[PDB]
């Protein structure tokens, strides 16, 4: 899904900019599956990832330090480490923790001067979302529901 790549890239750009860095009248019909506009998915995910970042100073330290992310890291290690964010199963709060992990991974790579990692990390996130999370999402009321719940 394109829309998921668009979510990833928006959330990351947002987080990088936030830390001072850089990435580099018609409604839907009812038969549409998401009738909620993408802008509002994005806005809600931005806010929730911001809120998640404020509650959890700690998180990912074991996870990011398990990762030891370099230009040699494969997707499979990222995947393994992300699986642990979902150890107890998928729910919307763990989806926010995932995006937030990706964001923190990006900020860390630009800090250690490995800009090249940004689009890889995004790509791993699109892949993870599409392989692993999107099937749960589209069976749990879509990003429409996520906006309902957090927006």
The widest CA-to-CA distance across the chain, in whole angstroms, is 49
The CATH number of domain 1-151, selected from 1.10.150.20, 3.30.450.20, 1.10.437.10, 3.50.50.60: 1.10.437.10
Distance CA 138, CA 127 (A): 16
Distance CA 39, CA 74 (A): 31
Rounding to the nearest 10 degrees, give the CA dihedral for residues 53, 72, 120, 33.
-80
- Residue 60 CB partners (closer than 8 Å, separation 6+): 100, 101, 104
CB 45 within 8 A of CB 11: yes
Distance CA 50, CA 82 (A): 19
Distance CA 7, CA 10 (A): 5
Distance CA 133, CA 56 (A): 22
Nearest to 99 by CA among 35, 25, 42, 39: 42
Main-chain dihedrals φ then ψ at residue 105, nearest 5 degrees: -60, -45
**Angle subtended at Cα 131 by Cα 146 and Cα 144, rounded to the nearest 5 degrees:** 15
CB 92 within 8 A of CB 136: no
From the number of C-beta atoms within 10 Å of its C-beta (0-12, 13-18, 19+), residue 114 rates as middle
Span between the terminal Cα atoms of the chain, in Å:
22
Which method was used?
A: X-ray
Domain boundaries, the chain: 1-151
CB 35 within 8 A of CB 28: yes
């Amino acid at each position: 899904s394109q829309s998921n790549r668009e979510l990833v890239v928006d959330f990351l750009s947002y987080k990088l900019s936030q830390k001072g860095y850089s990435w580099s009248g018609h409604s839907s019909s009812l038969d549409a599956r998401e009738v909620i506009p993408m802008a509002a998915v994005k806005q809600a995910l931005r806010e929730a990832g911001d809120e998640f970042e404020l509650r959890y100073r700690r998180a990912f330290s074991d996870l990011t330090s398990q990762l030891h992310i370099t230009p040699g890291t494969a997707y499979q290690s990222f995947e393994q480490v992300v699986n642990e964010l979902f150890r107890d199963g998928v729910n919307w709060g763990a989806i926010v923790a995932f995006f937030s992990f990706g964001g923190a991974l990006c900020v860390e790579s630009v800090d250690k001067e490995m800009q090249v990692l940004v689009s890889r990390i995004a790509s791993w996130m699109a892949t993870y979302l599409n392989d692993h999370l999107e099937p749960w999402i589209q069976e749990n009321g879509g990003w429409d529901t996520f906006v309902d719940l957090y927006g």
